[PDB]
């Protein structure tokens, strides 16, 4: 349904308002949208192996 | 993990460093605290920055792909279409979970290089003046301020 | 403009949703509402006077 | 203030104690820091709590207020319509202001006399063992320990 | 209490004292019992009294208020009518409810007082004739008679 | 009557006092007189004037408002008329008085709790140097000049 947001990408389920490269909502874009991929977990590590010593 | 230092000859990290991802943990008669090695963790998140900005940058956003429609008569061309979206689909899918295994397996083995790093620098600075003991443990043999221990941070050390 | 959005709350100006006892929005009113008041004010203390001594 | 405690004889309140809204400050050969007098923040809570419940539930929720039509021949009514709506909204904007204005008064009033209250209950424990110093201050005589301490917190202090 | 006497430094009243409002319980060798402070007592009662009297003659007397009719061309009348019966009936009832939670509570506040005020006059009669010991109780020096009792009483007793 | 120095211990006011509403009465061998306590003064002078404001300015000029003829078939909305400019009028005498014997009350509170604050204050500086003689008075041991009673008044002299 219409409502007056306004976003740089639309997709047939929602608008998507977000600067990751790539996204897994659909693969039908209008704009300025996030790359398709059908993966449910893309996260890269920045930090090292997490090791408490508890 | 591919240099023994992460998991290997240091046990365990420390959950009372908050200043940086590598650092020393002194116990002078002056007391003890946690004090990050500024050189290395700055280093290394000036590496991550870079791959983190490379992995963003190499894709092109994303503009309008739209659905077509084919008529009763050209189901051959609605096959091309669907074979040509899929097949590139798939192929940046791949991409996509290629270069996240690849690239975290590369993470971990970059941070376990830099405490191997950090380990070596204090091991040929501290020389006859200290032996192992809970491997990353230094004893001296004089017993130096913490003045003396952030010349071992800072790397320069006046003493054989 | 109507939108997809639900509130115990409607006035000319938009919907109020609070649970503080006064409102100074709008006079018109459609369902549970708080009181029209016209100040710009109605703070209430609770703890003592403020005095650092910096 | 209205008892004299708050920006009187105690100049200023302590940014230290987080706690509660009441405490006191050690100086024991133990060490020194803040703690909250329980008893008296739990009242002035209760009692501020029970201020804050009654002046929102007493006025009831405003239910559908519209304003209604009148035509060419039917002023006089829109005049009664509205000197109606004028009026009820004059005398709930005069009980809401007054009502805030009255109790804020007497909020930083109670504060001044839990202060009091609190500094007068010390002085009949501590009585002969200590004098005002600092007017909140009081230097022990026999130099009692943390224990002691929290004696004259919970206020029992079984010494003359 | 606002003013610590009540509920604070006296931990309780007398049941035993039924003469007054306040007063004061005599020990001696010549016998124990309770004797109310008449000053204090009527004071207290005199004020009260107006103060009752002042909100009961405040509130003028309703004369004759009945229900009105409207035909089926009249439901604008109608719901202006009821809308000036609801909005006095509102404010009526939340001006009478908050002026009894606040009234009671400076009547306690009164009572707190007059008992602050009874013992502070006693303590200024009894200054190096005797220490408080029971926080409302001063043991005599000299040990004086039911006459002595009576001149603390009638604001007389100027002894050093 | 709330704090107990207005018709309390010190049992009247001085017809001498003239330059404000509280002061010290000179007693030294340098000849008697009377000195304004000029703080206390302009401290309950501000607040005094604040709720003289905030009485005055909270409810706004009344604009105007005149009568309305109704016909012989107009009984009922006259009578609505009537009920309305009666229940209003009723309500804006009501909280007028309410205001007005509230803020009377506490107004003579509020100056009966700053001769507290003032006499406190002058006793913990006093101390161990002078006495009490005639409830208000304190009697100097050691005796001093005008400028030292002057150095009681601007908020000095720290002698045990």
Known sequence: ?54 | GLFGAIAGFIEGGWTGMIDGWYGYHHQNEQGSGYAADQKSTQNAINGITNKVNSVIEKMNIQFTAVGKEFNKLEKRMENLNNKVDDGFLDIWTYNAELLVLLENERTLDFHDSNVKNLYEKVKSQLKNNAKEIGNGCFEFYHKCDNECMESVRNGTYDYP
């Not at chain 1, 047939?12 to 059908?38: D, F, M």
């Open chain 1, 1 to 54: 349904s219409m409502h007056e947001c306004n976003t740089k990408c639309q997709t047939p389920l929602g608008a998507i308002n977000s600067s990751l490269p790539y996204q897994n909502i659909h693969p039908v874009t209008i704009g300025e949208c996030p790359k398709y991929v059908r993966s449910a977990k893309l996260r890269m590590v920045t930090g090292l192996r997490n090791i408490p010593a508890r």
